[PDB]
Design a protein around this ligand. Structure first.
Ligand SMILES: N[C@@H](Cn1cc(I)c(=O)[nH]c1=O)C(=O)O
Ligand SMILES: N[C@@H](Cn1cc(I)c(=O)[nH]c1=O)C(=O)O
Ligand SMILES: [Zn+2]
Ligand SMILES: [Zn+2]
Ligand SMILES: [Zn+2]
Lengths: 258, 258
Protein backbone atom coordinates (compact mmCIF):
# COMPACT_ATOMS: atom_id res chain seq x y z
CA UNK A 1 0.00 0.00 0.00
CA UNK A 2 2.13 2.86 1.30
CA UNK A 3 5.31 3.20 -0.80
CA UNK A 4 8.47 2.74 1.29
CA UNK A 5 11.12 5.22 0.19
CA UNK A 6 14.72 4.52 1.18
CA UNK A 7 17.00 7.55 1.30
CA UNK A 8 20.19 8.77 2.96
CA UNK A 9 21.08 11.63 5.36
CA UNK A 10 23.27 13.72 3.08
CA UNK A 11 22.93 17.55 3.15
CA UNK A 12 21.17 19.27 1.45
CA UNK A 13 19.31 16.26 -0.01
CA UNK A 14 17.93 14.96 3.27
CA UNK A 15 18.51 16.54 6.67
CA UNK A 16 16.85 16.33 10.06
CA UNK A 17 14.64 19.36 10.78
CA UNK A 18 15.58 21.45 13.83
CA UNK A 19 12.60 20.38 15.92
CA UNK A 20 12.35 16.92 14.32
CA UNK A 21 12.01 15.40 17.80
CA UNK A 22 8.63 17.14 17.95
CA UNK A 23 7.50 15.92 14.51
CA UNK A 24 6.49 12.52 13.11
CA UNK A 25 6.91 10.59 9.87
CA UNK A 26 7.91 12.47 6.74
CA UNK A 27 7.64 15.82 8.55
CA UNK A 28 10.87 15.08 10.46
CA UNK A 29 12.94 15.65 7.31
CA UNK A 30 13.76 18.48 4.90
CA UNK A 31 15.86 18.82 1.76
CA UNK A 32 16.13 18.57 -2.00
CA UNK A 33 15.14 14.85 -2.08
CA UNK A 34 12.44 15.33 0.58
CA UNK A 35 10.87 17.95 -1.77
CA UNK A 36 11.39 15.74 -4.83
CA UNK A 37 9.77 12.70 -3.13
CA UNK A 38 6.68 14.72 -2.17
CA UNK A 39 6.47 15.95 -5.79
CA UNK A 40 6.90 12.53 -7.46
CA UNK A 41 4.34 11.13 -5.01
CA UNK A 42 1.85 13.95 -5.72
CA UNK A 43 2.31 13.55 -9.50
CA UNK A 44 2.04 9.75 -9.47
CA UNK A 45 -0.63 9.77 -6.81
CA UNK A 46 0.78 7.53 -4.08
CA UNK A 47 1.27 7.64 -0.31
CA UNK A 48 4.83 6.99 0.91
CA UNK A 49 7.03 6.75 3.96
CA UNK A 50 10.60 8.15 4.01
CA UNK A 51 13.07 5.84 5.78
CA UNK A 52 16.80 6.36 6.18
CA UNK A 53 18.93 3.43 4.93
CA UNK A 54 20.03 1.37 7.97
CA UNK A 55 23.69 0.98 7.10
CA UNK A 56 24.02 4.56 5.78
CA UNK A 57 25.47 3.39 2.41
CA UNK A 58 24.67 3.98 -1.26
CA UNK A 59 25.03 0.45 -2.58
CA UNK A 60 27.88 -1.93 -3.36
CA UNK A 61 28.05 -5.71 -3.79
CA UNK A 62 30.60 -7.50 -1.56
CA UNK A 63 32.55 -10.03 -3.72
CA UNK A 64 32.52 -13.53 -2.25
CA UNK A 65 29.44 -12.98 -0.07
CA UNK A 66 27.77 -11.41 -3.13
CA UNK A 67 25.47 -9.34 -0.88
CA UNK A 68 24.29 -5.83 -1.85
CA UNK A 69 24.42 -3.18 0.86
CA UNK A 70 23.08 0.35 1.16
CA UNK A 71 20.03 1.73 -0.57
CA UNK A 72 20.66 -0.62 -3.52
CA UNK A 73 20.48 -3.60 -1.18
CA UNK A 74 17.21 -2.34 0.32
CA UNK A 75 15.68 -2.40 -3.17
CA UNK A 76 17.27 -5.70 -4.22
CA UNK A 77 16.06 -7.53 -1.07
CA UNK A 78 12.66 -5.90 -1.05
CA UNK A 79 13.05 -3.75 2.06
CA UNK A 80 12.08 -0.63 0.10
CA UNK A 81 9.98 0.18 -2.98
CA UNK A 82 11.90 3.16 -4.30
CA UNK A 83 15.08 5.10 -3.56
CA UNK A 84 15.02 8.91 -3.79
CA UNK A 85 18.56 10.11 -3.15
CA UNK A 86 21.80 11.34 -4.79
CA UNK A 87 22.28 7.74 -6.00
CA UNK A 88 24.56 7.49 -9.03
CA UNK A 89 23.36 5.63 -12.13
CA UNK A 90 25.99 2.98 -12.87
CA UNK A 91 26.30 -0.12 -15.04
CA UNK A 92 26.69 -2.62 -12.13
CA UNK A 93 23.67 -1.18 -10.36
CA UNK A 94 21.50 -1.09 -13.50
CA UNK A 95 22.14 -4.83 -13.80
CA UNK A 96 20.24 -5.40 -10.52
CA UNK A 97 17.88 -2.36 -10.21
CA UNK A 98 16.11 0.09 -12.54
CA UNK A 99 16.92 3.80 -12.73
CA UNK A 100 14.86 6.71 -14.04
CA UNK A 101 16.52 9.11 -16.47
CA UNK A 102 18.80 11.51 -14.45
CA UNK A 103 17.17 14.13 -12.20
CA UNK A 104 20.62 15.69 -11.77
CA UNK A 105 23.75 15.73 -13.93
CA UNK A 106 27.21 15.75 -12.32
CA UNK A 107 30.82 14.62 -12.33
CA UNK A 108 33.66 13.82 -9.93
CA UNK A 109 35.42 17.05 -8.93
CA UNK A 110 38.29 18.29 -6.75
CA UNK A 111 37.64 20.21 -3.53
CA UNK A 112 40.53 22.18 -2.03
CA UNK A 113 41.01 24.46 0.95
CA UNK A 114 41.40 27.93 -0.63
CA UNK A 115 45.04 28.58 -1.45
CA UNK A 116 46.05 24.99 -2.21
CA UNK A 117 48.44 24.90 -5.23
CA UNK A 118 46.34 22.33 -7.19
CA UNK A 119 44.34 22.98 -10.36
CA UNK A 120 43.72 19.50 -11.75
CA UNK A 121 43.74 15.74 -11.22
CA UNK A 122 47.03 15.55 -13.15
CA UNK A 123 48.43 17.97 -10.56
CA UNK A 124 47.36 15.74 -7.68
CA UNK A 125 48.79 12.61 -9.36
CA UNK A 126 52.19 14.27 -10.03
CA UNK A 127 52.85 15.49 -6.47
CA UNK A 128 53.05 13.93 -3.02
CA UNK A 129 52.87 16.74 -0.40
CA UNK A 130 49.10 17.15 -0.59
CA UNK A 131 47.16 13.99 0.29
CA UNK A 132 43.77 13.23 -1.35
CA UNK A 133 40.96 10.70 -1.12
CA UNK A 134 37.28 9.96 -1.62
CA UNK A 135 34.11 8.85 0.19
CA UNK A 136 35.08 5.29 1.19
CA UNK A 137 31.98 3.62 -0.17
CA UNK A 138 30.43 4.74 -3.41
CA UNK A 139 30.65 5.34 -7.13
CA UNK A 140 33.47 7.91 -6.76
CA UNK A 141 35.77 5.34 -5.15
CA UNK A 142 34.73 2.76 -7.74
CA UNK A 143 35.44 5.21 -10.54
CA UNK A 144 39.12 5.34 -9.51
CA UNK A 145 39.30 1.60 -8.78
CA UNK A 146 38.00 0.60 -12.22
CA UNK A 147 39.66 3.37 -14.29
CA UNK A 148 42.08 2.37 -17.04
CA UNK A 149 42.94 6.04 -17.62
CA UNK A 150 46.56 6.83 -16.66
CA UNK A 151 46.12 9.82 -14.34
CA UNK A 152 43.15 8.30 -12.56
CA UNK A 153 44.77 4.85 -12.17
CA UNK A 154 47.96 6.52 -10.90
CA UNK A 155 45.74 8.37 -8.38
CA UNK A 156 44.09 5.04 -7.35
CA UNK A 157 47.40 3.19 -6.73
CA UNK A 158 48.34 5.96 -4.32
CA UNK A 159 44.91 6.19 -2.64
CA UNK A 160 44.48 2.41 -2.19
CA UNK A 161 47.87 2.09 -0.52
CA UNK A 162 47.89 5.34 1.46
CA UNK A 163 48.34 5.05 5.21
CA UNK A 164 46.60 6.31 7.16
CA UNK A 165 43.45 5.96 5.02
CA UNK A 166 42.70 8.82 2.65
CA UNK A 167 39.12 7.57 2.44
CA UNK A 168 36.32 8.95 4.63
CA UNK A 169 33.11 7.58 6.13
CA UNK A 170 30.91 10.55 5.13
CA UNK A 171 31.04 13.76 3.05
CA UNK A 172 31.07 15.82 6.25
CA UNK A 173 34.17 13.95 7.36
CA UNK A 174 35.91 14.66 4.05
CA UNK A 175 35.01 18.38 4.19
CA UNK A 176 36.25 18.71 7.80
CA UNK A 177 39.50 16.98 6.79
CA UNK A 178 39.95 19.47 3.89
CA UNK A 179 39.16 22.38 6.26
CA UNK A 180 41.50 21.22 9.01
CA UNK A 181 44.49 20.13 6.84
CA UNK A 182 46.14 23.54 6.17
CA UNK A 183 45.82 22.69 2.47
CA UNK A 184 47.51 19.29 2.85
CA UNK A 185 44.36 17.34 1.96
CA UNK A 186 42.26 17.66 -1.22
CA UNK A 187 38.94 15.85 -1.53
CA UNK A 188 37.51 14.14 -4.62
CA UNK A 189 33.72 14.27 -4.57
CA UNK A 190 30.61 14.69 -6.68
CA UNK A 191 30.46 18.15 -8.29
CA UNK A 192 27.03 19.20 -6.99
CA UNK A 193 28.25 18.54 -3.45
CA UNK A 194 31.45 20.50 -4.09
CA UNK A 195 29.26 23.47 -5.22
CA UNK A 196 27.02 23.15 -2.18
CA UNK A 197 29.96 23.20 0.28
CA UNK A 198 31.43 26.16 -1.61
CA UNK A 199 28.34 28.15 -0.49
CA UNK A 200 28.61 27.20 3.22
CA UNK A 201 30.43 29.01 6.00
CA UNK A 202 33.36 29.31 6.67
CA UNK A 203 33.61 29.73 2.86
CA UNK A 204 37.14 28.33 2.82
CA UNK A 205 36.80 25.60 0.19
CA UNK A 206 36.48 25.72 -3.57
CA UNK A 207 36.03 23.54 -6.62
CA UNK A 208 39.04 23.50 -8.96
CA UNK A 209 39.47 22.30 -12.53
CA UNK A 210 36.89 20.58 -14.68
CA UNK A 211 34.93 17.46 -13.78
CA UNK A 212 36.78 14.14 -14.12
CA UNK A 213 33.69 12.49 -15.65
CA UNK A 214 29.98 12.88 -16.51
CA UNK A 215 27.06 11.02 -14.97
CA UNK A 216 23.72 11.37 -13.26
CA UNK A 217 21.64 10.61 -10.22
CA UNK A 218 18.51 8.62 -10.82
CA UNK A 219 15.42 7.50 -8.91
CA UNK A 220 15.76 3.73 -8.31
CA UNK A 221 13.25 0.87 -8.09
CA UNK A 222 13.56 -3.00 -7.97
CA UNK A 223 13.74 -4.60 -11.42
CA UNK A 224 10.29 -5.13 -12.86
CA UNK A 225 8.64 -2.80 -10.35
CA UNK A 226 5.26 -1.35 -11.30
CA UNK A 227 6.52 2.06 -10.04
CA UNK A 228 9.44 2.25 -12.46
CA UNK A 229 7.81 3.48 -15.65
CA UNK A 230 5.61 5.94 -13.78
CA UNK A 231 8.44 7.51 -11.82
CA UNK A 232 10.69 7.86 -14.89
CA UNK A 233 7.95 9.85 -16.64
CA UNK A 234 7.57 12.01 -13.50
CA UNK A 235 11.29 12.86 -13.52
CA UNK A 236 11.08 13.87 -17.20
CA UNK A 237 7.92 15.98 -16.65
CA UNK A 238 9.32 17.64 -13.49
CA UNK A 239 12.54 18.47 -15.36
CA UNK A 240 10.65 19.92 -18.34
CA UNK A 241 8.40 21.95 -16.07
CA UNK A 242 11.49 23.44 -14.44
CA UNK A 243 11.00 22.03 -10.92
CA UNK A 244 14.45 20.37 -10.77
CA UNK A 245 16.14 23.71 -11.50
CA UNK A 246 14.04 25.47 -8.84
CA UNK A 247 14.89 22.86 -6.21
CA UNK A 248 18.60 23.17 -6.88
CA UNK A 249 18.37 26.96 -6.49
CA UNK A 250 16.41 26.68 -3.27
CA UNK A 251 18.80 24.31 -1.51
CA UNK A 252 22.08 25.55 -3.00
CA UNK A 253 21.94 29.27 -3.74
CA UNK A 254 18.84 30.77 -2.10
CA UNK A 255 20.30 29.31 1.08
CA UNK A 256 23.92 30.20 0.20
CA UNK A 257 26.02 31.58 3.06
CA UNK A 258 28.94 33.01 1.04
CA UNK B 1 19.36 -9.85 -38.77
CA UNK B 2 21.22 -6.66 -39.79
CA UNK B 3 20.16 -3.74 -37.57
CA UNK B 4 18.79 -0.72 -39.44
CA UNK B 5 20.11 2.36 -37.67
CA UNK B 6 18.34 5.63 -38.46
CA UNK B 7 20.38 8.78 -38.03
CA UNK B 8 20.57 12.39 -39.22
CA UNK B 9 23.18 14.39 -41.18
CA UNK B 10 24.10 16.85 -38.45
CA UNK B 11 27.78 17.75 -37.97
CA UNK B 12 29.89 16.48 -36.20
CA UNK B 13 27.56 13.59 -35.33
CA UNK B 14 27.12 12.29 -38.86
CA UNK B 15 28.84 13.76 -41.91
CA UNK B 16 29.67 12.38 -45.37
CA UNK B 17 33.47 11.84 -45.54
CA UNK B 18 35.58 13.96 -47.89
CA UNK B 19 36.29 10.89 -50.06
CA UNK B 20 32.81 9.37 -49.73
CA UNK B 21 32.95 9.08 -53.52
CA UNK B 22 35.02 5.91 -53.67
CA UNK B 23 33.30 4.48 -50.59
CA UNK B 24 30.04 2.59 -49.99
CA UNK B 25 27.73 1.64 -47.11
CA UNK B 26 28.63 2.79 -43.59
CA UNK B 27 32.05 3.84 -44.96
CA UNK B 28 30.68 6.99 -46.60
CA UNK B 29 30.13 8.45 -43.13
CA UNK B 30 32.18 9.77 -40.26
CA UNK B 31 31.29 11.47 -37.02
CA UNK B 32 30.62 11.23 -33.31
CA UNK B 33 27.52 9.08 -33.85
CA UNK B 34 29.24 7.03 -36.56
CA UNK B 35 31.98 6.11 -34.07
CA UNK B 36 29.40 5.50 -31.31
CA UNK B 37 27.36 3.18 -33.54
CA UNK B 38 30.41 1.08 -34.36
CA UNK B 39 31.21 0.86 -30.63
CA UNK B 40 27.75 -0.25 -29.62
CA UNK B 41 27.64 -2.75 -32.50
CA UNK B 42 31.07 -4.13 -31.54
CA UNK B 43 30.22 -4.50 -27.85
CA UNK B 44 26.75 -6.01 -28.55
CA UNK B 45 27.92 -8.17 -31.46
CA UNK B 46 25.48 -7.11 -34.19
CA UNK B 47 25.69 -6.01 -37.84
CA UNK B 48 24.15 -2.70 -38.87
CA UNK B 49 23.42 -0.35 -41.71
CA UNK B 50 23.38 3.43 -41.27
CA UNK B 51 20.45 5.11 -43.01
CA UNK B 52 19.78 8.84 -42.95
CA UNK B 53 16.20 9.55 -41.82
CA UNK B 54 13.95 10.11 -44.85
CA UNK B 55 12.39 13.44 -43.93
CA UNK B 56 15.54 14.77 -42.23
CA UNK B 57 13.66 15.33 -38.96
CA UNK B 58 14.22 14.52 -35.29
CA UNK B 59 10.66 13.55 -34.45
CA UNK B 60 7.33 15.15 -33.59
CA UNK B 61 3.70 14.08 -33.62
CA UNK B 62 1.32 15.83 -35.99
CA UNK B 63 -1.40 17.41 -33.82
CA UNK B 64 -4.10 16.56 -36.40
CA UNK B 65 -3.20 13.16 -37.89
CA UNK B 66 -1.48 11.99 -34.65
CA UNK B 67 1.33 10.63 -36.84
CA UNK B 68 4.97 10.65 -35.73
CA UNK B 69 7.62 11.97 -38.12
CA UNK B 70 11.42 11.90 -38.17
CA UNK B 71 13.66 9.39 -36.46
CA UNK B 72 11.05 8.82 -33.72
CA UNK B 73 8.47 7.95 -36.38
CA UNK B 74 10.75 5.43 -38.06
CA UNK B 75 11.15 3.63 -34.77
CA UNK B 76 7.45 3.91 -33.90
CA UNK B 77 6.31 2.55 -37.24
CA UNK B 78 9.06 -0.06 -37.32
CA UNK B 79 10.97 1.32 -40.34
CA UNK B 80 14.17 1.33 -38.27
CA UNK B 81 15.58 -0.75 -35.40
CA UNK B 82 17.61 1.85 -33.51
CA UNK B 83 18.28 5.62 -33.68
CA UNK B 84 21.82 6.82 -32.90
CA UNK B 85 21.82 10.61 -33.20
CA UNK B 86 21.67 13.87 -31.18
CA UNK B 87 18.08 12.97 -30.17
CA UNK B 88 16.76 14.58 -27.01
CA UNK B 89 15.16 12.46 -24.30
CA UNK B 90 11.74 14.03 -23.70
CA UNK B 91 8.49 13.01 -21.99
CA UNK B 92 6.34 12.82 -25.13
CA UNK B 93 8.95 10.69 -26.89
CA UNK B 94 9.55 8.40 -23.89
CA UNK B 95 5.82 7.65 -24.09
CA UNK B 96 6.22 6.06 -27.53
CA UNK B 97 9.86 4.82 -27.72
CA UNK B 98 12.61 3.71 -25.34
CA UNK B 99 15.70 5.82 -24.61
CA UNK B 100 18.94 4.60 -23.11
CA UNK B 101 20.51 6.67 -20.35
CA UNK B 102 22.04 9.84 -21.85
CA UNK B 103 25.23 9.52 -23.89
CA UNK B 104 25.61 13.30 -23.73
CA UNK B 105 24.30 16.01 -21.38
CA UNK B 106 23.43 19.44 -22.78
CA UNK B 107 21.15 22.46 -22.67
CA UNK B 108 19.65 25.24 -24.80
CA UNK B 109 22.16 28.03 -25.42
CA UNK B 110 22.42 31.30 -27.31
CA UNK B 111 24.58 31.71 -30.42
CA UNK B 112 25.41 35.31 -31.40
CA UNK B 113 27.33 36.69 -34.36
CA UNK B 114 30.11 38.48 -32.43
CA UNK B 115 30.03 42.01 -31.26
CA UNK B 116 26.27 41.47 -30.88
CA UNK B 117 25.09 43.36 -27.76
CA UNK B 118 23.40 40.25 -26.29
CA UNK B 119 24.60 38.48 -23.16
CA UNK B 120 21.52 36.49 -22.11
CA UNK B 121 17.92 35.31 -22.58
CA UNK B 122 16.68 38.38 -20.69
CA UNK B 123 18.63 40.64 -23.07
CA UNK B 124 16.97 38.98 -26.02
CA UNK B 125 13.44 39.38 -24.59
CA UNK B 126 13.90 43.10 -23.73
CA UNK B 127 14.70 44.12 -27.32
CA UNK B 128 13.31 43.88 -30.85
CA UNK B 129 16.24 45.14 -32.97
CA UNK B 130 17.81 41.64 -32.90
CA UNK B 131 15.68 38.77 -34.25
CA UNK B 132 16.03 35.28 -32.82
CA UNK B 133 14.58 31.86 -33.45
CA UNK B 134 15.13 28.13 -33.17
CA UNK B 135 15.17 24.93 -35.21
CA UNK B 136 11.92 23.10 -36.01
CA UNK B 137 10.42 19.68 -35.20
CA UNK B 138 12.82 19.78 -32.28
CA UNK B 139 12.87 19.86 -28.50
CA UNK B 140 14.24 23.44 -28.56
CA UNK B 141 11.22 24.97 -30.30
CA UNK B 142 8.97 22.97 -27.96
CA UNK B 143 10.81 24.20 -24.86
CA UNK B 144 9.80 27.81 -25.55
CA UNK B 145 6.23 26.88 -26.52
CA UNK B 146 5.73 25.04 -23.25
CA UNK B 147 7.74 27.40 -21.01
CA UNK B 148 5.81 29.14 -18.24
CA UNK B 149 8.92 31.13 -17.29
CA UNK B 150 8.30 34.87 -17.76
CA UNK B 151 11.34 35.46 -20.00
CA UNK B 152 11.06 32.31 -22.10
CA UNK B 153 7.33 32.93 -22.72
CA UNK B 154 8.13 36.54 -23.63
CA UNK B 155 10.56 35.11 -26.23
CA UNK B 156 8.01 32.61 -27.60
CA UNK B 157 5.14 35.09 -27.96
CA UNK B 158 7.58 36.94 -30.20
CA UNK B 159 9.04 33.94 -32.07
CA UNK B 160 5.72 32.20 -32.55
CA UNK B 161 4.14 35.14 -34.36
CA UNK B 162 7.35 36.71 -35.67
CA UNK B 163 7.08 37.65 -39.35
CA UNK B 164 9.33 36.91 -41.23
CA UNK B 165 9.64 33.48 -39.60
CA UNK B 166 12.59 33.23 -37.21
CA UNK B 167 12.47 29.42 -37.38
CA UNK B 168 14.77 27.21 -39.46
CA UNK B 169 14.25 23.79 -40.92
CA UNK B 170 18.01 23.09 -40.54
CA UNK B 171 20.86 23.84 -38.08
CA UNK B 172 23.15 24.82 -40.99
CA UNK B 173 20.48 27.31 -42.03
CA UNK B 174 20.37 28.76 -38.51
CA UNK B 175 24.14 29.19 -38.35
CA UNK B 176 24.15 30.68 -41.89
CA UNK B 177 21.45 33.15 -40.82
CA UNK B 178 23.48 34.26 -37.80
CA UNK B 179 26.60 34.57 -39.95
CA UNK B 180 25.01 36.64 -42.75
CA UNK B 181 22.83 38.79 -40.45
CA UNK B 182 25.27 41.54 -39.55
CA UNK B 183 24.52 40.67 -35.92
CA UNK B 184 20.77 41.19 -36.32
CA UNK B 185 19.86 37.55 -35.73
CA UNK B 186 20.71 35.35 -32.75
CA UNK B 187 20.09 31.61 -32.84
CA UNK B 188 18.82 29.44 -30.00
CA UNK B 189 20.26 25.93 -30.17
CA UNK B 190 21.65 23.01 -28.19
CA UNK B 191 24.90 23.75 -26.34
CA UNK B 192 27.11 20.98 -27.79
CA UNK B 193 26.25 22.21 -31.30
CA UNK B 194 26.87 25.84 -30.31
CA UNK B 195 30.34 24.85 -28.94
CA UNK B 196 31.17 22.92 -32.11
CA UNK B 197 30.30 25.91 -34.36
CA UNK B 198 32.43 28.26 -32.21
CA UNK B 199 35.45 26.12 -33.22
CA UNK B 200 34.69 26.29 -36.99
CA UNK B 201 36.15 28.91 -39.30
CA UNK B 202 35.24 31.70 -40.14
CA UNK B 203 35.23 31.65 -36.29
CA UNK B 204 32.70 34.44 -36.26
CA UNK B 205 30.14 33.04 -33.81
CA UNK B 206 30.07 32.78 -30.05
CA UNK B 207 27.98 31.06 -27.43
CA UNK B 208 26.88 33.53 -24.74
CA UNK B 209 25.36 33.06 -21.30
CA UNK B 210 24.66 29.81 -19.54
CA UNK B 211 22.28 27.04 -20.65
CA UNK B 212 18.55 27.76 -20.32
CA UNK B 213 17.91 24.16 -19.24
CA UNK B 214 19.34 20.64 -18.80
CA UNK B 215 18.58 17.59 -20.90
CA UNK B 216 20.34 14.65 -22.49
CA UNK B 217 20.59 12.74 -25.75
CA UNK B 218 19.85 9.04 -25.69
CA UNK B 219 19.98 6.15 -28.15
CA UNK B 220 16.40 5.25 -29.03
CA UNK B 221 14.71 1.93 -29.78
CA UNK B 222 11.05 1.07 -30.28
CA UNK B 223 9.17 -0.15 -27.16
CA UNK B 224 9.39 -3.91 -26.63
CA UNK B 225 12.72 -4.11 -28.44
CA UNK B 226 15.23 -6.58 -26.97
CA UNK B 227 18.05 -4.37 -28.21
CA UNK B 228 16.96 -1.65 -25.79
CA UNK B 229 18.17 -3.17 -22.55
CA UNK B 230 21.43 -4.25 -24.14
CA UNK B 231 22.16 -0.88 -25.76
CA UNK B 232 21.42 0.95 -22.49
CA UNK B 233 24.04 -1.10 -20.65
CA UNK B 234 26.32 -0.45 -23.63
CA UNK B 235 25.95 3.33 -23.20
CA UNK B 236 26.68 3.09 -19.46
CA UNK B 237 29.67 0.81 -20.16
CA UNK B 238 31.16 3.14 -22.82
CA UNK B 239 30.74 6.26 -20.73
CA UNK B 240 32.33 4.58 -17.73
CA UNK B 241 35.41 3.60 -19.78
CA UNK B 242 35.82 7.25 -20.76
CA UNK B 243 35.05 6.53 -24.40
CA UNK B 244 32.26 9.13 -24.81
CA UNK B 245 34.68 11.73 -23.48
CA UNK B 246 37.34 10.44 -25.91
CA UNK B 247 34.86 10.81 -28.81
CA UNK B 248 33.78 14.27 -27.61
CA UNK B 249 37.31 15.68 -27.70
CA UNK B 250 38.14 14.05 -31.04
CA UNK B 251 35.27 15.57 -33.00
CA UNK B 252 34.99 18.86 -31.11
CA UNK B 253 38.46 20.21 -30.27
CA UNK B 254 41.12 18.00 -31.87
CA UNK B 255 39.42 18.90 -35.12
CA UNK B 256 38.77 22.52 -34.12
CA UNK B 257 40.08 25.33 -36.32
CA UNK B 258 40.05 28.45 -34.14
N1 LIG C 1 26.45 9.06 -5.38
C1 LIG C 1 27.42 8.01 -4.89
C2 LIG C 1 27.79 8.29 -3.47
N2 LIG C 1 28.72 9.39 -3.38
C3 LIG C 1 28.24 10.56 -2.94
C4 LIG C 1 28.96 11.68 -2.84
I1 LIG C 1 28.03 13.48 -2.14
C5 LIG C 1 30.42 11.63 -3.30
O1 LIG C 1 31.17 12.57 -3.27
N3 LIG C 1 30.81 10.40 -3.78
C6 LIG C 1 30.02 9.22 -3.85
O2 LIG C 1 30.44 8.19 -4.29
C7 LIG C 1 26.84 6.64 -5.13
O3 LIG C 1 25.76 6.58 -5.65
O4 LIG C 1 27.55 5.66 -4.68
N1 LIG D 1 17.99 17.35 -30.36
C1 LIG D 1 16.68 17.90 -30.83
C2 LIG D 1 16.85 18.52 -32.18
N2 LIG D 1 17.54 19.78 -32.08
C3 LIG D 1 18.80 19.78 -32.47
C4 LIG D 1 19.60 20.83 -32.40
I1 LIG D 1 21.59 20.62 -33.02
C5 LIG D 1 19.05 22.12 -31.80
O1 LIG D 1 19.68 23.14 -31.69
N3 LIG D 1 17.74 22.02 -31.41
C6 LIG D 1 16.91 20.89 -31.50
O2 LIG D 1 15.77 20.90 -31.11
C7 LIG D 1 15.63 16.82 -30.81
O3 LIG D 1 15.96 15.71 -30.49
O4 LIG D 1 14.48 17.22 -31.17
ZN1 LIG E 1 4.43 19.38 -9.19
ZN1 LIG F 1 34.65 -0.24 -27.00
ZN1 LIG G 1 -0.53 18.45 -39.94
Amino acid sequence: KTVVVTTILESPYVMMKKNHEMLEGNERYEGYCVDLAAEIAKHCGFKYKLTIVGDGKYGARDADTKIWNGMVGELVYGKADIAIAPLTITLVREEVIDFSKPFMSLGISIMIKKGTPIESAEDLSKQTEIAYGTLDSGSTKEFFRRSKIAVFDKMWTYMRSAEPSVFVRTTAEGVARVRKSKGKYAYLLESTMNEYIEQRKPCDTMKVGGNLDSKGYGIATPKGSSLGNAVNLAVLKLNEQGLLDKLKNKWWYDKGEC
